Every structure is written in structure tokens, then in C-alpha cells.
Amino acid sequence: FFMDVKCQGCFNITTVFSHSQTVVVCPGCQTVLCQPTGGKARLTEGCSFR
Amino acid sequence: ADVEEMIMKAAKKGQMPSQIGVVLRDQHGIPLVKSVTGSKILRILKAHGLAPEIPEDLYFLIKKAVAIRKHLERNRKDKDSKFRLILVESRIHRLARYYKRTKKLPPTWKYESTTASTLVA
Amino acid sequence: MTKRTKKAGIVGKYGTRYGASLRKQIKKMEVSQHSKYFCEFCGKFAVKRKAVGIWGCKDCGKVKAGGAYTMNTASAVTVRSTIRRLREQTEA
Amino acid sequence: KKVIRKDSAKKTAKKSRVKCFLKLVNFTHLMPTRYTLDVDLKEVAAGPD
Amino acid sequence: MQNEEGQMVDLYVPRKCSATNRIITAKDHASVQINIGHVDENGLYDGRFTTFALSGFIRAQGDADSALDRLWQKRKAEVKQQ
Amino acid sequence: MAPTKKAKKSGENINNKLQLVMKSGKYTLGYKTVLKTLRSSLGKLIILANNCPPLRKSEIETYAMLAKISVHHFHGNNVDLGTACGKYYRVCCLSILDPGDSDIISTTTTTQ
Amino acid sequence: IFASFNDTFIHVTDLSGRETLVRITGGMKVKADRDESSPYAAMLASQDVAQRCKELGITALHIKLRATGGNKTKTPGPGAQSALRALARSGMKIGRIEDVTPVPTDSTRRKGGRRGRRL
Amino acid sequence: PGRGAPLAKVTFRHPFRYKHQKELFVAAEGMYTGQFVYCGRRATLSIGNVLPIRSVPEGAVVCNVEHHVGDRGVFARASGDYAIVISHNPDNGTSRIKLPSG
RNA sequence: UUCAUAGUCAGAGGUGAAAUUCUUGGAUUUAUGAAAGACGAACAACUGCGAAAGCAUUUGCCAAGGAUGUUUUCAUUAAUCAAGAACGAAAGUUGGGGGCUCGAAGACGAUCAGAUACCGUCCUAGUCUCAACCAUAAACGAUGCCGACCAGGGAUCGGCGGAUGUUGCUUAUAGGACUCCGCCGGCACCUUAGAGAAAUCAAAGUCGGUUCCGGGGGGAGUAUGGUCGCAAGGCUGAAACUUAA
């Protein structure tokens, strides 16, 4: 699916995929985003569907 | 339709070969390359792309098989009693025999390399 | 096989003369030594017999004690494993 | 590291690169085993074991 | 004494650490749910527990089943280590 | 499996991405040239695939120290590392340089 | 004072029953059985015997030395078992606690039907 | 030749004066050229090392066992045999060993 | 079980009934302590996992494989397959270590008409470990293996999409589980209607792929020759003849 997220810390907006396979790094610097994990990557950014 | 939906959210031509073509050249790894950028952009690679040149791919299945075989061969020189193990090693060697039926009819170099590669890296 | 029916290894050493219960064992127990063996140190198919219980690797030259007929065996293996386990429990 | 031994003969000198690697590696083993002992002792004297 | 130390060894803190490990270990089986025990360093049980589930909860159960009688018997144990 | 429990040897997935590096590798094969390459300081990782003798492991390790290497003691003289490297390889000492790739050295820069 | 202490054990085999009155120290004061009297055999396997034994012990155990408090401990099921305890009450001994504590079957795991002897 | 099984030639080099060192010690299974031998009380518990029974962990197969201390080793000698040290405990008094006859 | 130490008397062992056996030179039973060997009760369940055989102390290490979810790669790549090759319980066989409970054969007592039998005591290889053979089991799910479709119903395990708050942790909070539905793979039962000789199956269905293989019983999974095995034996595999089953 498509998901628009915004970094709380970066306060920047970015678009990442849901339940991604690898760690998602903020393009702004490189802070963590969603995490892959032990499955079902979820997250720690906020927004809605893009 | 499917593809058109992705085009409107992407970038598609010109930009994409440059974005893709760094990551391949540190060393190989095509499914990894699709899992970075830019997200939307790399999704529509497979729906509109040839793809570009690489060392490996065609080798990678054979390379990985030789790589497991050499450690498994150590644990088939220590104690025989690992009766489950002998047909793990035999399966990849012999899947390699199956793989080098199909990726041998389209091209040269593959015929020549793939006999020899078995046991030597 | 080559020109061998039953099988042999040694069995010509008997000939027709000699006899059967003992022949089931003795191919097996000289020939299992004869089997090129990979050295525990190097891995090349060097290991050959110096004497009874004495084995030596031709390439690296590492010479080892072992069974009379064989390079190894169950008993040696078991003894080493038990010792290692005991040291590991004490270290604990 | 010659033991040399002696000719005119059928002798066997012990082996030139190997008895320098056997001394240089004894020394390369003695210098980390002394440095680790010198570290282990620095750490044990400073705080723990 | 020392044999009683040497085999007892350490504290209330290691009982908890030991309880924590048996709870991680368990699951394997089916999934549910009851048993933990830690058998000591010489020969008593520190404690036995009623669990499902988790790392904090069973350090607690560990803290709890290590209440007075069992707590006191490691406190006797640990004093004997000296 | 879980952090504190059940089986795990996932560090061995080094071998899968090494084989995958080896595919187009810059590399070094055998002591005489390995010795040329480690003494040129180029290598970032070496694998030693045989239960290599005290003297003849420590010499490779001192070259690894002179260079900027990490030492993988594969050490089991079966050499299934030889599957990647060319399986005529009954004995194997191996250096890794630019494969045209390489998180692999980083992957195995943490132990397991 | 009644410190009142005298541990009693009930030892079960299907065939027969015997009592030993021990103490904390582990020496045995007395034991009593069948076959000190005449009936032997398939007269043994009785529960009647478990009674008689349960008493022959007690009468001594108690007048001379004088124990009163005693902890009852028994081992897995015999015919005699129930009857063994039941007389300990009429013993004029005050039964302190009752523990069954048998030896379970517990991984005495062999084919030689070791397992079966135990409940 | 005097028993038909192998010895391992060991050097042994330690000093003092008298110092004494040497030589051809009884082989165990698995002893090889270039393996380390340790002889004494805080020797590592590894095959081929010699040390008093007290230092040995229970349940470990041994050979060249002494009758009497410093006689140097009597029982378990011949080819493929071994004694088994069953009991110790910290046994100040006695170490119980089972010889190959049982 | 053995050893040692404590204490102690006239039995104990064993069964249908007994005897063998054990037994005053102090047993057994009893307490504590040591060593060795074996196995993992309780847990362990219509339960999970390996290709199968099989595999169960927790715990640490190397390394494999099947779930899923991804839509990445080959983009239908694939499937089954005589020959070939690998593994393949137990029991046997062989060298060497260990050898406790157990335990063929064997030694004996009872039974009894006989017992070399069940039942009892004793007992060795074996059981076990490392090395190395064998190639077989009621190797069974009595169901080859591949794929498609065709009924539901109770929940079991794994993950997955969660929904939903609460225990409960911890405490910014979240899952382990829990109220709670759905998917995917296996499981099994419960359990259908057209099939099956019926019993039953819900796959053994509705009819397609593919290999092996079958031949009335007995003679016979035997003869003979070839092949493998140290041997045991195995794979391979008939007829004369006999019978109205």
C-alpha cells in the first residue's frame, strides 16, 4: 500500500511503504523511522494515506 | 492500469538509472536496490525496465551453492552421524545441475564457467 | 568390479587356501586402514599407516596415535567428548 | 634458527623459514601474551579481574 | 562452611536472574504455562512459580515466591557463603 | 531464535553474502600472493579455511594486523568455502578486496 | 514435655509389610514384621498382618522408651497400607502428620518392569 | 616392541638442575605431533595430559594410573584399555577407579 | 546397583500356591555420604518437527528446513522417472572403551503327563558409546508421488491482517496471553451429500499426469545362476506338480 509519513523529530514529510522489509532512514539526516523488526514492520512516524 | 497508477507517483525515466546504478556497483544485490530510495520510484522498475548490466545474478545461485558446500563438507568430514545433513548438501549441488539446464541455453560463458565453478568459489 | 566377483581387497593373500568367517573380517580390517584419509590438521588425502596404531599424513607430516587398524573409531571420540564436557561443567 | 646439524653427511638442518617463523611467531606470540598480561594486570590492578 | 558457599553462590539477585532465565526457556513445549523452578547451586530449590507471562512479571513472581520462607533460606544460604 | 533461547548460527549467513561477493570478487587466492596483497595493506577481510598450524596462522594474523583486516577462522579443513572459490580447493587461505559490492565485511564485523 | 517425637515409616511391598520406627538421627529402634509369628506366605500379603505389625512395633515403642508424637510417613500402595495407618491411631500414639511420599515412578525407565512396581 | 602399541616421543625442556626431563611417554588415542602435553597438578584436562586423580573430573577415562604416588603409573597400559575414575568428591581420602576388568 | 558409615533382629524374596534364591560370618528393611551407568517421570496433549527412519533434561554453540508476509528474480521457469546415487528402526556382525538396573541363551525350582513353556530366581553377549558393516520391520496413514475441483462444523499450533479493551507487565508504552473475527500451511477428529463389495472415505470422490508393480491358492518370495555383504542374509526370481479352491 502507499503511506505518507512525517518524521516527528525531523518534522519533515516523507513517503515510506507499509511493513517494509529494511530500516527506513530519514532522508533529511538519517534518523530512524520505521524499523523493520521481527516482522511486521511498524512504526514510529505519523500521518495518513497518501 | 496498474502500471499507470504507479507512473503518476514515480519519476520513471532519466532519473532512475542514475539512482539505481550506484548501489549495484558497490557489489551486486538487485533485490536490495529495490528496497531503498525513494520507494515509489523503484517499485515501477519491474513494470518498465530491461534491466541494466551487472556481474553476478547468473552466477549468484552457483556462487552461493559453492559457499555453503565448503562448510557443509567440513561437517561431512567430522562425524558421519549427521544423517539429515548429507541430503542438504546433495540438494543444492543437484539443484545447481537443474539451474544450469535453463540458464545455459540463452548464452555463452555460462556453459564454460558452470562446470568448473563447482568446488572453486 | 574390475575382474572380481565376490570381493577381495586382501583375499588373494589367502588364495583358495585358508577359509570364510575370518575372511569376512580381515578384508575389512586391513582395507579400512588402506583408505586414504584426510588429515585432521590439513585436510589433504594424505593419511597413511607408519606402524600398528601409528598414522602419518604425508603432506604436513603430522603423525598420530590411533587404533591399530583404523585412524579412528568410536572409543577415542567418546573419551575426548566426555573430557571436554567435564572441563566445561567445572569452568561454569 | 639453525641447530644446523652436521655434514659431510645425509643430515637434516632444521628448516630456515620455519625456525624464524618459529622464533618470530614465538616472539609475536610472546609480545601479545605479554601485552594481554600487561593489559590484564593493568585492568585487575585498576578495578576488576 | 565454604562448601555451603561454593555451591550456594551468590545472593537474592542471582535467584531472580535464575528465575528470569527459566521463564524465557519454558515456552518450548505447547505454550501454557505453569512451571518454573530453579534448582540451586548445591541442593535446594530457590523457588517454584505461577506464571503467564513475561520478563517483568516473572522477575516479580521470582521476587514474590522469594517471599519470607524461601527468601530467608537464600539469606541463610548467602550468609553461610561467608 | 528468541534473544535468550532456542537455536541460532545466523552469523553463517556471512558465507551466503561472501559467495555472492566472490561471484565478481576482487580477491586474493593462496599464501604467496595473499602475502603480496596483505603486505600491500589492501585487504579488509581474510578467511583461513584450514586448522592452520600455530606459526602459519599467526603469520597471516600479523599481516592482517599490518593491514586493516579481520580474520575469519573458517578453520575446518573440509573447505566448503571452496565451493565458492573453486572446489579443487582442498586447502584455502583467502583475502577479500573490492567485490564491486560489500556490506559482507560489515555484516561479519559484528560476531555471533 | 511432649517434644513428642517419633517418626514412623510404613514400607510397602505388595507381598508383605514391615515397619521400622527410626529417629531424626537415622538409627532404627525396632522393627516388627510378619513372620516373627507363624503365618507366612500367602499369609503375609494380608492387611491383617499390616495391623499386627503396625501394633507389635507400637506397644514397645511406646511403655519403655515412651514416644508419643510421631510423624507418619508411607510409601506407595500395599494391601496392608491403609490398615497400617489405621492401627497407628488406635496405637495411643498421637499421629503428628501424614505424608504419603512414596517414591513415584520417576524415570526408573527400563523394560524390566521396574516402572510397574511403583504407583 | 615390548607391548605392541605406540609411544609418543615428547620433549620436555624445563630447567633447574637437577631438573629432570624426557622422554618417550605412553601414547593415548588422539596424540599427534605438534600437540601439547602437560604433566602435573594444574595441567589442563585434555587428552594426553598427566595429573593426579584429585585434579581429574569424575567420569573421565584415564590410563597409566599409579598404585602408589610417584611410582609414576601402573594400571591401564596395554593397547586400547582404560581405567575409569568414578569417584572422588573432593575426596581427601580416596579416589575410586574402575579398572578395565571391572 | 555397588562401596563406606550408622543402627538393628529373624526373616527376606516371590507368587495362584510354593520353592529355587537370599539368610545368623548380623541379612533385608532404615538414615546420610561417594562413584558409576542408564534414562529422561512429573512434563508430553486428537501434540509438534525431520525427506523418511525418527526425534523429548533444562541450558549454551555451528548450521539447516518447512509457515507467513514482500511482489525481488527466473517470469511459467516446471513436474514425475526404470537405470544411477543417498539416508534408512531394532536385532545381528566386528575392534576397542565402559558395563548399573535389564537380559536371550544357559544354570535351576515349581507346574505337570512332559516344560526345553507361561511363573520365580540367577545369568552372558546385548542394551550403551566412538569407529565400521547390513538394507530389512505391521518403514503403517495397511492409503506411491505430482496437480485441479468438489460440504460444512467444533479448536489445535505457528505466523499474518487485525478488531477491541482489559489483566499485566512494565509504565512514553507495548506485546506473552487474554475478548475476538478473518487468512495461510499441517493436523486430526467430528463429520456431508456421488462413490465404494460393504466396512468405510470426505478423500479412498469427480475423470487428468506419472512411475513402479500385480497376477487363483499352495508349491514360492522358493530353486538355479548372476550381483552386493565379513557373515547373517538381501535384491533379483521359475517349473515340475497339486487342488475345485
Three-state SS annotation for chain A: CEEEEECCCCCCEEEEECCCCCCCECCCCCCECCCCCCCCCCCCCECCCC
Q: Which sign, positive or negative, has the C-alpha torsion B76, B97, B92, F72?
A: positive
For C:35-64, CB contacts with B below 8 A are 38, 43
**Which bases of chain I are under 7 A from a protein CB atom?**
6-19, 28-45, 47, 50-53, 56, 58-65, 68-75, 77-79, 86-88, 93-103, 129-132, 156-162, 168-170, 175-178, 226-231
CB contact under 8 A, F51 and C41: yes
| DSSP category for residue B88 | H
In H19-51, which positions are buried (b, 16+ CB within 10 angstroms) versus exposed (e)? eeeeeebbbbbbbbeeeebeeeeebebbbbbbb
Which amino acid belongs to residue F78? N
**Residues comprising chain D, all counted:** 49
- Please answer whether residues G55 and G88 qualify as being in contact, where contact means their C-beta atoms are separated by less than 8 angstroms: no
- Phi first, then psi: give them for residue A2, nearest 5 degrees: -115, 140
For residue B70, give the 3-state DSSP assignment: helix
A 1-50 residues, CB < 7 A, strand I? 17-19, 21, 39-40
Window B:71-110, CB contacts with F under 8 Å: 71-78
Question: Measured between alpha carbons, how far is residue D43 from residues C91, D30, D33, D34 in Å?
Answer: 22, 19, 15, 14
Beta bridge partners of G20: G9, G31
- Which residue carries 513415584 as its cell? G104
Residues 90-119 of B with CB under 7 A from strand I: 90-92, 98-99, 101-103
Could you give phi then psi for residue E25, rounded to 5 degrees?
A: -60, -40
Where do breaks (C to N over 2.5 Å) occur in chain H, by preceding residue number? none
| Nearest DNA or RNA nucleotide to H96 (CA to C1') | I35
What is the identity of the amino acid at D22? Answer: L
Q: How far is H39 from chain C (nearest CA, A)?
A: 16
Enumerate the residues of chain C whose CB falls inside 8 A of the CB of residue B77: 38, 43
Q: Please report, as a single letter, which amino acid is at residue G86.
A: A
Per-residue burial over H54-71, b if 16 or more Cβ lie within 10 Å, else e, is: eebbeebbbbbbeeeeee
Task: Tell me phi and psi for residue C5, to 5 degrees.
Answer: -85, -90
In sequence order, what DSSP letters do the residues of G3-62 get, joined into one string? -----EEEEE-SS-EEEEEE-TT--EEEEE-SSSSS--STTTS-SHHHHHHHHHHHHHII
Say whether C20 counts as a known binding-site residue: no
Is C48 part of any known ligand binding site?
A: no
Question: Taking the CA atoms of chain C, what radius of gyration do you get in angstroms?
Answer: 18
Distance (Å, whole) CA H39 – CA H49: 6
**Where are any strands of DSSP class E within H1-102?**
7-9, 24-26, 60-62, 83-87, 96-98
C-alpha to C-alpha distance for B120 and B99, rounded to whole angstroms: 18
Within 10 angstroms of residue E44's Cβ, the number of other Cβ atoms is 15
State the nearest Cα–Cα gap between F11 and chain B, in angstroms.
13
DSSP collapsed to 3 states, E15-82? HHHHHHHHHHHCCCCCCCCCCCEEECCCCCEEEECCCCCCHHHHHHHHHHHCCHHHHHHHHHHHHHHC
> Residue C49's beta-bridge partner residues?
C55
| Cis peptide leading into residue E53 (ω within 30°) | yes
The answer for residues whose C-beta is within 8 angstroms of residue H73's C-beta and 6 or more apart is H26, H50, H64, H65, H66
Report how far residue A38's alpha carbon sits from residue G70's, in angstroms, rounded to the nearest whole number. 60
Strands G69-74 and G94-100 turn out to be parallel
Asked whether G25 and G13 are in contact (CB, 8 A), the reply is no
* Distance of alpha carbon G24 from alpha carbon G6, whole angstroms: 8
* Residue that has been written with the C-alpha cell 586414504 in this structure: C36
CA angle (G99 as vertex; G94, G104 as ends), nearest 5: 155
Alpha carbons H12 and G18: distance in angstroms, whole number: 65
Q: How far apart are CA B115 and CA B66, in angstroms?
A: 12
Question: Is the peptide bond prior to D8 cis by the omega test (within 30 degrees of 0)?
Answer: yes
Cell numbers placing H42: 594444574
Question: Using the CB atom, is residue F32 less than 7 Å from strand I?
Answer: no
**In 3D, which of B110, B102, B118 has the Cα closest to residue B66?**
B118
Residues of A with CB under 8 A from a CB of B: 2, 15-17, 20-22
The residues, any chain, with a CB within 8 Å of residue H16's CB and separated by 6 or more, are: none
DSSP conformation class of H87: E
Collapsing DSSP to helix, strand or coil, C56 comes out as strand
